[PDB]
């Protein structure tokens, strides 16, 4: 589909709550996935945000790609 976004460049403390607040303005979010390093406790700096509507995902990409989050430049593309 074209409803799931790949989001890279996430600071270590960015979590599901942070991601949801940053992306919910574009439309309903179905789920957020944050792959973790099993040995350690933290994530790897990227996540997946799935929108209910492809149209909302598109708007999210257009606005969020190369934007700032926790002082880091993030990259947003179709997963």
Notes on the protein architecture:
This protein has a single domain, classed as Alpha-Beta Plaits. The chain is 24% helix and 30% strand. The chain has helices spanning 16-23, 54-64; strands spanning 4-8, 29-33, 46-51, 68-69, 72-73, 75-78. The strands form two sheets. It has a four-stranded antiparallel beta sheet, covered by helices on one side. A two-stranded antiparallel ribbon has the order 4-5. β4 (68-69) and β5 (72-73) form a beta hairpin.
Write a compact overview of the structure shown.
The protein is an alpha+beta fold and 79 residues long. Helix content is 24%, strand content 30%. The longest helix is centred in the last third of the chain and has 11 residues.
> Can you count the beta strands?
6
In the CATH scheme, the class would be Alpha Beta
General shape: globular
**What share of the residues does DSSP label as strand, in percent?**
25-35%
- Major sheet summary line: 4 strands, antiparallel
Quote the distance from N terminus to C terminus.
Answer: 9 Å
CATH topology, what is it called?
A: Alpha-Beta Plaits
Domain RRM: 3-79
Subcellular location: Nucleus
Family: Belongs to the cyclophilin-type PPIase family. PPIase E subfamily.
Protein name: Peptidyl-prolyl cis-trans isomerase E
Which helices and strands appear, and what pairs or packs with what?
Blueprint: E1 4-8, H1 16-23, E2 29-33, E3 46-51, H2 54-64, E4 68-69, E5 72-73, E6 75-78
Antiparallel strand pairs: 1-3, 1-6, 2-3, 4-5
């Amino acid at each position: 589909s074209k409803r799931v976004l790949y989001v890279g460049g996430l600071a270590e403390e960015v979590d599901d709550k942070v991601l949801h607040a940053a992306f919910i303005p574009f439309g309903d979010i179905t789920d957020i996935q944050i792959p973790l390093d099993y040995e350690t406790e933290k994530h790897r700096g990227f996540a997946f945000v799935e929108f209910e509507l492809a149209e909302d995902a598109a708007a999210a990409i257009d606005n969020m790609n190369e934007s700032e989050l926790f002082g880091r430049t993030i990259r947003v593309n179709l997963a």
